Structures are given as structure tokens and as C-alpha cells.
Design an enzyme around this catalytic site. Structure first.
Site, mmCIF file in Angstrom:
data_model
loop_
_atom_site.group_PDB
_atom_site.id
_atom_site.type_symbol
_atom_site.label_atom_id
_atom_site.label_comp_id
_atom_site.label_asym_id
_atom_site.label_seq_id
_atom_site.Cartn_x
_atom_site.Cartn_y
_atom_site.Cartn_z
ATOM 1 N N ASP B 114 0.850 -1.231 -0.077
ATOM 2 C CA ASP B 114 -0.014 0.235 0.109
ATOM 3 C C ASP B 114 0.678 1.273 -0.086
ATOM 4 O O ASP B 114 0.738 2.287 1.133
ATOM 5 C CB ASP B 114 -1.017 0.023 1.144
ATOM 6 N N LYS B 121 11.188 3.387 -13.334
ATOM 7 C CA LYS B 121 12.526 2.942 -13.397
ATOM 8 C C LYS B 121 13.410 3.557 -14.467
ATOM 9 O O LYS B 121 12.985 3.900 -15.484
ATOM 10 C CB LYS B 121 12.692 1.392 -13.758
ATOM 11 N N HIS B 190 12.828 19.127 -2.823
ATOM 12 C CA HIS B 190 13.563 18.276 -2.287
ATOM 13 C C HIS B 190 12.922 16.726 -2.082
ATOM 14 O O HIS B 190 13.467 15.951 -1.938
ATOM 15 C CB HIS B 190 13.930 18.654 -1.106
ATOM 16 N N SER B 208 18.822 0.700 6.782
ATOM 17 C CA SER B 208 18.452 -0.619 7.378
ATOM 18 C C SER B 208 17.162 -0.914 6.657
ATOM 19 O O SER B 208 16.785 -2.272 6.955
ATOM 20 C CB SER B 208 18.208 -0.725 8.817
ATOM 21 N N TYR B 257 19.522 -8.913 11.385
ATOM 22 C CA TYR B 257 18.255 -9.053 12.086
ATOM 23 C C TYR B 257 17.723 -10.406 12.515
ATOM 24 O O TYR B 257 17.284 -11.043 13.630
ATOM 25 C CB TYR B 257 17.172 -8.262 11.207
ATOM 26 N N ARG B 260 19.963 -11.831 15.359
ATOM 27 C CA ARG B 260 19.578 -11.062 16.581
ATOM 28 C C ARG B 260 18.195 -11.784 17.309
ATOM 29 O O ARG B 260 17.916 -11.529 18.386
ATOM 30 C CB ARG B 260 19.417 -9.619 16.479
ATOM 31 N N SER B 376 10.563 5.004 1.695
ATOM 32 C CA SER B 376 10.694 5.884 0.743
ATOM 33 C C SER B 376 9.409 6.716 0.530
ATOM 34 O O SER B 376 9.540 7.929 0.727
ATOM 35 C CB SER B 376 11.115 5.279 -0.747
ATOM 36 N N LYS B 382 7.846 12.684 4.650
ATOM 37 C CA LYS B 382 8.669 13.533 5.648
ATOM 38 C C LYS B 382 9.017 14.736 5.129
ATOM 39 O O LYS B 382 8.953 15.882 5.455
ATOM 40 C CB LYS B 382 9.879 12.627 5.870
ATOM 41 N N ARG B 454 0.472 -5.960 7.952
ATOM 42 C CA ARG B 454 -0.696 -5.655 7.255
ATOM 43 C C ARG B 454 -0.715 -6.310 5.851
ATOM 44 O O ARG B 454 -1.535 -7.189 5.540
ATOM 45 C CB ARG B 454 -0.939 -4.326 7.196
HETATM 46 N N1 LIG Z 1 -0.768 1.323 -5.739
HETATM 47 C C1 LIG Z 1 -2.049 1.063 -5.652
HETATM 48 N N2 LIG Z 1 -3.176 0.841 -6.674
HETATM 49 C C2 LIG Z 1 -4.267 0.682 -6.288
HETATM 50 N N3 LIG Z 1 -4.698 0.987 -5.004
HETATM 51 C C3 LIG Z 1 -3.752 1.321 -4.016
HETATM 52 C C4 LIG Z 1 -2.315 1.393 -4.147
HETATM 53 N N4 LIG Z 1 -2.081 1.673 -3.168
HETATM 54 C C5 LIG Z 1 -2.943 1.858 -2.051
HETATM 55 N N5 LIG Z 1 -4.045 1.464 -2.842
HETATM 56 C C6 LIG Z 1 -5.340 1.708 -1.917
HETATM 57 O O1 LIG Z 1 -5.715 3.001 -1.773
HETATM 58 C C7 LIG Z 1 -6.875 3.048 -0.571
HETATM 59 C C8 LIG Z 1 -6.859 4.346 0.308
HETATM 60 O O2 LIG Z 1 -5.850 4.780 0.966
HETATM 61 P P1 LIG Z 1 -6.096 4.217 2.584
HETATM 62 O O3 LIG Z 1 -6.369 2.834 2.676
HETATM 63 O O4 LIG Z 1 -6.794 5.341 3.518
HETATM 64 O O5 LIG Z 1 -4.628 4.617 3.202
HETATM 65 P P2 LIG Z 1 -3.151 3.161 3.175
HETATM 66 O O6 LIG Z 1 -3.280 2.744 1.469
HETATM 67 O O7 LIG Z 1 -2.015 3.809 3.619
HETATM 68 O O8 LIG Z 1 -3.944 1.871 3.928
HETATM 69 C C9 LIG Z 1 -6.482 1.534 0.137
HETATM 70 O O9 LIG Z 1 -7.698 1.023 0.362
HETATM 71 C C10 LIG Z 1 -5.564 0.763 -0.641
HETATM 72 O O10 LIG Z 1 -6.128 -0.549 -0.929
#
Ligand SMILES: Nc1ncnc2c1ncn2[C@@H]1O[C@H](COP(=O)(O)OP(=O)(O)O)[C@@H](O)[C@H]1O
Ligand SMILES: Nc1ncnc2c1ncn2[C@@H]1O[C@H](COP(=O)(O)OP(=O)(O)O)[C@@H](O)[C@H]1O
Ligand SMILES: Nc1ncnc2c1ncn2[C@@H]1O[C@H](COP(=O)(O)OP(=O)(O)O)[C@@H](O)[C@H]1O
Lengths: 496, 496, 496
Positions: B114, B121, B190, B208, B257, B260, B376, B382, B454
């Protein structure tokens, strides 16, 4: 027969070399620094390859409802001159190597005709016959978008144009997609692309532009005694007789103008046959024929030849069609003394050699068919100026003219007791016709002519100065590499 | 022994078919329009292929004074999620097709953890060994520039990053070039690229990252009875024993890790040899010894093994290096039950098919080395936040924590005369050592973990759903195609 | 019954005056200059009317190939606060005056809840039910364009939203069309509009929002002795009973949440009929009932009750529903001690007077139903932030928590000779359930409830300052005029 790319490449490496030497010595050896100036021939090593090529894959929803993902590419050869100029070509037979090539050719071509654009060309792997008007537009628009979103379509970055697969309709769209999207705020958004409808800001005189270009390309050389004596021409019996291979736009017009000034068309030959008649062939008869029904095949006051007029006996042979049409093979068997390249690369670099052996004057693609480009420059400008050429001045001029005559008249009538005896105040029929119907086209046409002339001369000169003979081509490519060079050199690189 | 691209493309097509079905029915069948929804699969035809790929040539004047044009390319796979993310590689082997492929992997890999970025690339056909620190810089910078002027670098469009061939030193130049040029006015200039020096705006815990990723990755499965039964694992006696192939960054940390936490590292092979010792190897020791000298070769407390450690006897094998290391050949000869892909593509499609047939769990590149990316994203954020994670809250929370303790203590002393009898107010040693040395790194590490966990579950669930087994890789590609699809679908294309 | 315009206008003019005076003397009579400060009540003359309102007529080409112009508006009430906020309505009966009115409300509603947005609203004279999904989309996109070209959609300008007549599908398109056109370069283009799908950048907890709002509104007051005495409530036998006209979104959740905490729903209506049962009705069961088949009519465990429940003896009446439902008419006949305006303008002005005479505590729409708006403002930020609330802290917190418990434990153990004799280290079952399933919605819900609270308190205070009573409405409108004035005042106008 080699592919367009190997060819240009060649051409360039040829004129590169030639230049080099001269390019250092009598061009900048007054401020010589460790003759490591020879090393600055890297500039040409930069100039050779295309600096940027963008390849894309974008979807559209075909009418039916099914999705399809279209591929295409636009290559920008050199940005020595800020707005890259170059067309778009819709055909299944496009290849990133082709567009790279052709982009290459433009950069040089422009330099030739002193058009301040960098070479660039695009291609979409698609066959227009397999798509609905509607679909087409969908495609061109979504092409314009991605093209823009990455810097390959802007009125300051890359102004596209049509190619013999695309038209004004498409351009129009391209213009309109841009202007009502990314370029919403650009006051020159309609300059993003040229070759557009007059309604959408096109420039009068685009059509005849490539054609007339050919004409003035030949004309300018025909009228030189020095080249027309190494051939034995500029007659006084037969005057001039030509032949055209390819009755498509360019050809047609080339026949129209070449014939409107003496020369007599004796052959014509499309991608379906030929024609012949050593008595002549009228442009406005053959045109109409080609229009009323199908092709030029079966045309009265003419007898059907078999094959390709390329050999037909004439003085001026004009290849206004497909690629590589004059090769090592048929090269010797051409009775013409003058070959006018009314199309990109219609003669091989083998054929050149030959035509060179047997005193044959080959008037370059790189120069002869750059009439379109020359006018496209103007279109651009037009757009930038937000006014049709002449809109403010035609009336002023017209007046200025009748005054200047009227003065003659008055002053002359002062040398005879009269008040209306003499009559200079009358323009020559042709003059009256000109002023009466003064329009944008005229200015253009003129601008066109003047470019073609001043470029021809340039060519000539840069041929005599390297003692090339009828090697008009390499003379040209040289002339170009010098130019493009000059710019790069008078600046730098990342220390420009 | 295919090629990175055929692989990925295969992996996609695989997961794309497995989803098609259940992507219509059960996910959107209670709105069904003509069942021409199965024709909406053309969203997957759209996904598959990189939408944009830029290829350029650009000069630089080496330090001797000679010119040289350099060639490179960046490919953006998807824009489903705005800022394309992906690294830059400097090596004479780079190919458009490779970049295109890797890009492809990044889109999917990001969905898996997510991270809201679209796969990208870049690659510059160069060999950093042949250029001086001063030339390299020159090169990066110009790269940035052209890469910027055409939309392939930008804090909101594409955000590059390092690769095994590049480092924070370059990334720091990319940044600054950008900031001080095209991005002079962007308040988040930046953010144009991650993987940069703390000084320049990096994120504590970038190093790391990838490694820790790999560690969790394993952990999360090595602690799931289910899987660990199929294998006959989560042992009592031997606990766990692992080997890594590639003592680079990721391989070093992994071993650090993994060790450890119990796990015994028995072998460790580089590009120049290997090491073995069924008693164990210590990370620090074999780290210092890889730093004090050249390689890991001739390391004490460890005999030299000949060849790769891929066939060493062990529980966990971890490929943290080159490409296609595990092929149809050596596949059947691996003693490990779990292969943790600590690099992209270190196992061929053929190898997978073997591994499955002999019950071997292969934790997918796609997921396992997604730690880096994960962190990243954070860096990016950040930079947007313009603050080091925790800068404002650390002390507040610290206080809140002593106030909690303090209440328990008062509220426990008011069930006994006294006013200082019972002392809860004291944090466990550990606690005190985590409150007293709070830092951004701690917030990044936790955020990392959470995302690995997750995701892990996510995968696990999508495997059991589509009754896969230990085909963790195609689960994950599925899991990703299914995320990337949603986004696309929940809008459309031109009518998106 | 008057029109929404002449009502709001009134509500303003009423608070406006009630402020004027105090909004001079004790809130600025320190600096006093000429007492022509009274003439600076021109700021309110400014505050009253909408600054800008864009009307527009665009075309779309209806599936059947025709061509039709659409009309629509968007009125930005104030800009005192940068990003205007406010929804989009699709309906034949939308009038400029209506949006204008509605915009006007938002700008005060926001103030009430401390949501930094100016009031805006838009309408499109169209009935969805006459357009196809496709057509709808065309319409909502063109709209987005024309709205963006003129500064009425933009992440920093005007952030639209959904309204009963629209949904998240459209908001998703609105976003996408912006992000792919005009806002191509805005690294916050998906902040242009709220209400959109999670997959498009929506926030978790948008559908329980307005409902949980209602709840908290009522809860905040019910737990305030003072009020709860002038009423005679906060009971010890019959705790709390309630009714809820309307079973739509807001009603349902209202019922749910109020239930969940002890109250006992004793009558629910709907635009069909009603229910009844002095023993209590469950939210879940009715909810499902509603779902399973048609409308709440004929629900077991409850006996039909002709008309409306607005009369039905309770404790807390909830008007979630249509406009003007409590008029001078029925108003005295209402057993309820507390009316919680779940929707916009339920009660009249007349009705207000009456409920005032007979000690009724009406909780104003302006405040009560602002929970949706509040979240909304978070969704906005969400986009603007590029990360799901909690994504980096959940785990870190989890940990910190456990460490907390663990210290309490160990400490306590060190007042008894045994290393595992005391067991604090165990959360409450609830606690464990909240820790396990942490999510964005939690943070959102929290944030909602802290806004609700803080603003209830504000309303109260503001009512006990202008000694207002159970005139909660005006007290609010006043609280808002004040706010919006202070912003203006602490700047200026042209010299602002
Ligand atoms: N690369 C992606 N392509 C399609 N959907 C994505 C991608 N990355 C994240 N998502 C979706 O974006 C949605 C909305 O963001 P949210 O779930 O609120 O925050 P997080 O993605 O940090 O869990 C999530 O339900 C997730 O499944
Ligand atoms: N494509 C080109 N590449 C490099 N130089 C060019 C190119 N086109 C034109 N030039 C140069 O630009 C220069 C400056 O323009 P100028 O000569 O004043 O106007 P014009 O180009 O219309 O004759 C000319 O000296 C010409 O040689
Ligand atoms: N729409 C508004 N119009 C005028 N003032 C507002 C508005 N919304 C919020 N404010 C004021 O902005 C001020 C500064 O923000 P602050 O109170 O620090 O954060 P928060 O508004 O979230 O409580 C608050 O005092 C609040 O009263």
C-alpha cells in the site's frame, strides 16, 4: 535498398567529415588553444543522435465499446533551435527507428531553408482505414494529451504537423485538445501545431506550399548558366520538358507550376500505371480527370506507358512519391539530366554515385521539398502574431502605390502645358490584378520564394567552396551541419 | 533462464487471469450491464504495458576535456497513482526492456505494501568505475535536467531513487540540481527524489530499511503455524538456520536481524566466493571483516565453500543479490524450505514450478524486498510534512507517559496511608531506554513493520481465497492487480 | 412557508444585530477612534452577500447522438477563509438564489465547527433519472472543466462535494477530470473535491460522519447539568428516550449511536408511515428490515402509528429529514424536551419562539448536522497530506501502550517477591479490541467528536454571554458572525 536511417546517418557522416577540417582552420584558428579544438568535433558527435524519444501506450474506447491500447512515438532530434518541428504519421508501418531518422532529416532540412526549428517526428502504429472518424479523433486527442504532459507538443517546445497519412482535421483537434487542456493559459496555444484549417488559424497557401517549393527549387538552378552548361541546358529550341512520378499533391502542383512557365510535361505516373505523350499533357485536364473518376488511367490525349516514367526521355525528372524509387539498378537508364527530389529519399546513395558519374544534377529532398516546412514556419508565426499577413498594410500599400504613380504623372505633365495629358497613373494590368486581389497567400508565396532562392544560393556557394560538383546533396547536409554547429559552438554544452 | 521481462509479464498474465473471473462476478454483479463487463477486462490490457518511456542522449565533457554523449532512459509504468516512484541504475548492461520490466514490477510491488506510487525505473548505459566522482556528478545532473524538462522527475510526477549502482551522493545531486533549476519555485523540490543524505533531507532509517523489510517479511510467515506446517517447521530443537547469497546491503542487514532473533546463519556467499560453518557465523564479526579488508574471503571461524551457498543445507535461503540465481537447473538441489527473495527476480518461473512441486515456500521479491520503497514513501511524506517524524510529539508523549504512570501511583497509594509508598512511576528499563532515545528512526521502523505485517496478512488471505498454496508470489501479483484495477475502475479511462 | 433564502438572510440579520453592539464596546473599545467604529459594521454588510456566482451553459452529446446545453451554477459566499467548500446538486429545481442561500449557510456552518472553509454551493438544472450513467459522467466532467477554468474548482480555491442528488462516483470523476487537465501539475489535485471513494482518495468514516455528529451534538448538551436542569433531565429511572423522524442515512446512524449508549428509541417515522413501541426498537433489526424489503412499514415488535412521530412522547426528538417539519402549528404539541436538528432547517422561526416559551432545547442544524462537513475538512487534508491517518503511528502507539502496562506490572510486582504474580499487562477487553482493529476511521471519528464538543461549548458560552436561553440557533449564528467578522476585521477590505 538500405533503410532511410542508414541513409541519413550516412549522409550526415559524409558532410560531417567534409566539414570538420574547414570547420576548425579558416573558421576559428585565430584564437586557437592547443589545437584540442579538433577535439571539439564532439559537438558533431552530439548533433548526430536524437536527444529525446518518447514512446507511449495509451487506450481508447472503440465505437463498439471494446477497449484498445494504441502505441506511438515522437522523437525530437535537436533542440539547438527551441521549438521542435515535425509531423505525425498514422500507419502500421511506423517504427521508432524511422521517426528517429526522419526527425534527423528535419533538423537538417530546416537549417537548409533557415527555418528556426529542431527536427522531430511522431508515429502512431495505427491504420486510419480501420478506424471511424470519431475513433480517429479520440486517438489523436489522447495522443495530444500524453504528448503534452511529457513535453512533446507545445507552442514553444514542439509544434507538430500533418504527414501524408494525417490531415488538417486531426491537426485542428490536436490544436483544440491542447488549447482547452494543458495549454489553457497559453495565449499562443494555437501555435502548438501547424497545418491546421483556416478557420482554426491555418495560413493561406499551405496546400500549394510544398509544390511551389519544388518549382522554385528547380527554377533557381535551371536559371544558373554555370550548372546548366555542365549539363548542356537552358535551351533555345526545346526549352524544357519534364516528367513526374507520383500524381499526389506535390506532384500535381509541381506539374501545374512547372508547366505554367514553359516546360512541357511529357509523362506522369502514379501507383497504378503511367501516361505518355511527347506533345505535352495539360495539368488542369489531367487534374480534373484524376478527380472526376478514380485514377489517371485511361486519360485521352495520352497513351498508357508500362511501368514507371523514371526512364521516359525528358530533361527534368521529378520523383514526387514513395521512398527509394531510383536505385543502383535503374540509375544508369535515366534519360533526364535533372532529378528534382519532390519527396524524401527517392534516390539511393548508390544511385547518387552513378548520377554523379554521368553528370546528373540531383536537387536534394533536404532542400527541394522543404517548401512545406518553410510555410509551416510562417503558419506558426501567423499564430504568434494573431493577424493574417497584410491585414493592416494592404490598403496602405495600395494607396502608397497610386501616389507614387500619380507623382510620376504630375511631374511629367509639368514638362508640357497640360493637366491630364500623360497618364502614368495606370498600373500594368497584372499589377492592377495584384493589388486588387492582394491576400495573405501572396505574402506567403513571396516569403516562400525568397527563402528557396536565398537557400539555393547558399547551397551553391557551400558546394563551390568545398569543390563538390553536382553533389548538391552533400553540399547541403554540409551547409546544415555547419549551421547547427555554429549555434552549439557559440555557447557550449552544459557550459553552453 | 528467461529474462526479467518475460518473467514479470508472465507473472502478471497469470494473476490477471486468476482475477478476471471473480473481478466481475461477486465484486460488481449487482449493477451488471449486458455482461459486456467481461469486456472491461481491457483495463487489465491497459495496466500491463508501461504507458510512458523516455530515452535520451546527452553530452558531458569528461575531465580530460573530451566530449562524450551518454545514453539513458526512464520508464513510467503506471500513473494510476500520481507520483511515479522507482530507482536509477548506472550500468553498461541496462536495456530499455529491462527498465520497462522493473518499472512494471514497481507498480505492483507498491500496491502490495500500500504505497501510493506508480512504477517507474531509469537506467544510464554507463560504468561508474570509468568515471571520476566529478564526471559522475556532471552526468547525474544533466540527466536530472533533461529528465525534468520532459516530466520524468518531479516531486509530484516522478520521484527517482538509488539502486545498487547509485548512492545517496548522486541522489543528493539530483535533488539539488532540480531544486536550483526547474524546481526553483516548488516548496517541495526536495521531494523530487528519495534515498538522499540526512543533511539533504533523507529519512532516518533508510539504510536498514530494505533489510528490515526482508526480516519481517520472513518473520511474518515463519510465525504462521499453517504455512510452517506444510513445511514442517517452527521447530523446538534447531529453531532456525539460514543462509544468504549476497552480502551487499540487504544481505548484511538481513543476516543481522535474522540472527538477533535466534536464527543461525550457516553460510554467506558473495560474488567472489563463499563461507560455511554449521556452528554459526556472527554478523558483526563478518561485517567488520568485510570492511577492514576487501571481501569476506579468508574469514576466520569459517571454512571456504566452493561456489554458491544456494545448495547449502539450511532452513531459510535468502538470495540478496544478482538476477536469476535459482533456475530450473539447481532448483531441485536446494535444501532450504523457505526462499526469501531479498532481491528482484532471483528465481525463474521454471524454478518456481519446481519449488512448488517439492513444497518450498518462496517469499516474493514483489513483497519481501518492498521494505525500501515502504520507507521511501515515508521520506517523501517526511519532505511534504517538512519535518522529522516526531519532532513535535516526542516530549509531549513522554510527558503523557509519566502522567499515566504517576496516576496509577497516586491512585494506588490512596489505598494505603502513605504518599510515596508504591512506585509505579518507574518505567521498565527497556521503556526508559526507548523514551530517552526517541528518534525519527523509531517511527519509521514501526511504520515499516506495520506495513509488512498488514501486507503479509493481505497476501495470506488472498492465497487462501484463491486456494493457492505456497504460491505466495502469484497471490501477491493478484493482490496487486486487484488494487491497481480498483483505482482504474473507480474512475474510467478518458471518461475516468 | 418562506424560502431558504429569506430564512437564512433573516437568521443572519438577526445575529448580525445581536452582535454589532457587543462587537464594538467590550471587544475593541480600548483603542477607540472617533466611535466611527460603529461604521465598521460595514464588514457585516460585506459578509452578508455572496461575493461571486458563476452561471454557465455547457453542452454534452447525449448517448443517442443529439446535442444539448446544460445550465448550472456555483456560488462562492465568502473567501474570508481560502478554500471555499460546499456541495454539488443535480436537480431540475435548482435556482441561483437557492445555491446562493445555501452557500451562505455553509460559510456560517463551517465557522460553527471551526472548519476553515468559505461557503459555496453549486447546482446543475438536470434530473439524473433522465440521463444514463455515461451521460451523467460527461456532464459532471465538462462541468468540472468550465468550473476550473474560472476558478470555482481548485484544491486551494473551491473544493466541491456531494449532495443528496449526487454521489462518490461523480466526485470521483470531478477529481479525475481536474487532476488530468488543468491540475495536471498540482501535487494536491485530488484535494480539489471531497466525498470521493477510498480508492480515489476518500477518507474512512465519511458515511457514519453526519450521523455520529448528531449523536455527539446531543450527548454534549445532555451531559451539561445546567441545561439538563432547566429541562429537568439527565434522569435516574427512565434514563433517556428518543424518536427520530426520517430513517435515511443520518436518522439511522443517529438511532444506532444514541441507542448504543443507553437511550431507547421509541418511534421512527419515514416518508411512508411510522412505527411505535414504548418498550424500545433495535437499530440493527429495523435497519435490516428496511434493507431486506422496501420500507420500515410492517415491522414486527412494533405497532404502526399514523402520521408523524413528532408528537410521540419521548425525551429527545430527532428531525433527520425534509425541510420545515416543525411549524407554529404542531409546535406546542410536542412532548419532547430536546429537539436535535438532524437536517437543515427542520423547524421554522415561529416554532423556535414557541419551543422557547415552553422551555424546549433546540440544537441547531447549523451545528448539529455539521459532522459531515467536519469530516469533509479532514478528507481534504487527507488528500493534501498523502497518507491515511495513523499509517505511521498505530504500531508505535500499540507498543508504547504495552510498555506502559508492563511497567505498571513490573513495578507492582516489585512490592511482592514474584516475577509474574501481578498481571496488569492485560488491556480491558474493549481496549484490546480498539488496539487490534485500529484504523483511520477511529482518528476521524475522534476528531469529529472533539470538534463537536469544542463547538457545543462555544455555542453555549456564546448563548450565556448574550443571555439567550434555549435559542441555541441564534446563539450559533451569532457565534459564527463573530468568527467570520474577526477574520475580516483583523485585516480590512481593500486595505485588508
Ligand atoms: N498502488 C495502488 N494501486 C491501487 N490501490 C492502492 C494502491 N496503493 C494503495 N491503494 C489503496 O488506496 C486506498 C486508500 O488509502 P487508505 O487505505 O485510506 O490508506 P493506506 O493505503 O495507507 O492503507 C486503500 O484502500 C488501498 O487499498
Ligand atoms: N535550423 C537552423 N539551425 C541552425 N541555424 C539556423 C537554423 N535556421 C536558421 N539558422 C540561422 O539563424 C541565424 C539568425 O537569423 P537571421 O539570419 O537574422 O534570420 P533568417 O534565419 O530568417 O535569415 C541565421 O544566420 C541562420 O543561419
Ligand atoms: N470559518 C471560519 N471563519 C472565521 N474564523 C474561523 C473559521 N474557522 C475557524 N476559525 C478560527 O480560526 C482560529 C485559529 O485556528 P485554531 O483555533 O488554532 O484551530 P481550530 O480552528 O482547529 O480550533 C480559531 O480561533 C477559530 O475560531
Amino acid at each position: 535498398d538500405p533503410n532511410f536511417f542508414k541513409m541519413v546517418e550516412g549522409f550526415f557522416d559524409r558532410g560531417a567529415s567534409i566539414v570538420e577540417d574547414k570547420l576548425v582552420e579558416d573558421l576559428r584558428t585565430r584564437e586557437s588553444e592547443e589545437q584540442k579544438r579538433n577535439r571539439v568535433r564532439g559537438i558533431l558527435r552530439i548533433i548526430k543522435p536524437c536527444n529525446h524519444v518518447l514512446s507511449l501506450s495509451f487506450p481508447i474506447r472503440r465505437d463498439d465499446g471494446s477497449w484498445e491500447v494504441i502505441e506511438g512515438y515522437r522523437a525530437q532530434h535537436s533542440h539547438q533551435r527551441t521549438p521542435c518541428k515535425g509531423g505525425i504519421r498514422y500507419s502500421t508501418d511506423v517504427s521508432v527507428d524511422e521517426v528517429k531518422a526522419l526527425a534527423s532529416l528535419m533538423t537538417y532540412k530546416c537549417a537548409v531553408v533557415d527555418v528556426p526549428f529542431g527536427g522531430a517526428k511522431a508515429g502512431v502504429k495505427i491504420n486510419p482505414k480501420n478506424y471511424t472518424d470519431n475513433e480517429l479523433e479520440k486517438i489523436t486527442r489522447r495522443f495530444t494529451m500524453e504528448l503534452a504532459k511529457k513535453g512533446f507538443i507545445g507552442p514553444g517546445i514542439d509544434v507538430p504537423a500533418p504527414d501524408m497519412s494525417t490531415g488538417e482535421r486531426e491537426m485542428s483537434w490536436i490544436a483544440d485538445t491542447y488549447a482547452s487542456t494543458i495549454g489553457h493559459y497559453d495565449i499562443n496555444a494555437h501555435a502548438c501545431v501547424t497545418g491546421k484549417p483556416i478557420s482554426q488559424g491555418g495560413i493561406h497557401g499551405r496546400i500549394s506550399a510544398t509544390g511551389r517549393g519544388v518549382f522554385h527549387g528547380i527554377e533557381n538552378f535551371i536559371n544558373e548558366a554555370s550548372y546548366m552548361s555542365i549539363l548542356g541546358m537552358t535551351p533555345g529550341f526545346g526549352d524544357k520538358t519534364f516528367v513526374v512520378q507520383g500524381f499526389g499533391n506535390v506532384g500535381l502542383h509541381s506539374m501545374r507550376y512547372l508547366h505554367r512557365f514553359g516546360a512541357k510535361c511529357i509523362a506522369v505516373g502514379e501507383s497504378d500505371g503511367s501516361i505518355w505523350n511527347p506533345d505535352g499533357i495539360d495539368p488542369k485536364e489531367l487534374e480534373d480527370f484524376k478527380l472526376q473518376h478514380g485514377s489517371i488511367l485511361g486519360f485521352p490525349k495520352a497513351k498508357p506507358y508500362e511501368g514507371s516514367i523514371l526512364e521516359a526521355d525528358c530533361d527534368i525528372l521529378i520523383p514526387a512519391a514513395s521512398e527509394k524509387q531510383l536505385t543502383k539498378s535503374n540509375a544508369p537508364r535515366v534519360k533526364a539530366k535533372i532529378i528534382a527530389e519532390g519527396a524524401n529519399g527517392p534516390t539511393t546513395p548508390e544511385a547518387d554515385k552513378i548520377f554523379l558519374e554521368r553528370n546528373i544534377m540531383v536537387i536534394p529532398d533536404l532542400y527541394l521539398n522543404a517548401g512545406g516546412v518553410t510555410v509551416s514556419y510562417f503558419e506558426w508565426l501567423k499564430n504568434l502574431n494573431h493577424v493574417s499577413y497584410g491585414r493592416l498594410t494592404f490598403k496602405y500599400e495600395r494607396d502608397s502605390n497610386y501616389h507614387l504613380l500619380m507623382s510620376v504623372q504630375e511631374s511629367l505633365e509639368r514638362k508640357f502645358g497640360k493637366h491630364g495629358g500623360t497618364i502614368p497613373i495606370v498600373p500594368t494590368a497584372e499589377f492592377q490584378d495584384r493589388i486588387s486581389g492582394a491576400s495573405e497567400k501572396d505574402i506567403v508565396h513571396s516569403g516562400l520564394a525568397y527563402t528557396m532562392e536565398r537557400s539555393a544560393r547558399q547551397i551553391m556557394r557551400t558546394a563551390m567552396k568545398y569543390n563538390l560538383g553536382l553533389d548538391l546533396r552533400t553540399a547541403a547536409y554540409v551547409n546544415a551541419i555547419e549551421k547547427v554547429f555554429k549555434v552549439y559552438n557559440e555557447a557550449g554544452v552544459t557550459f553552453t
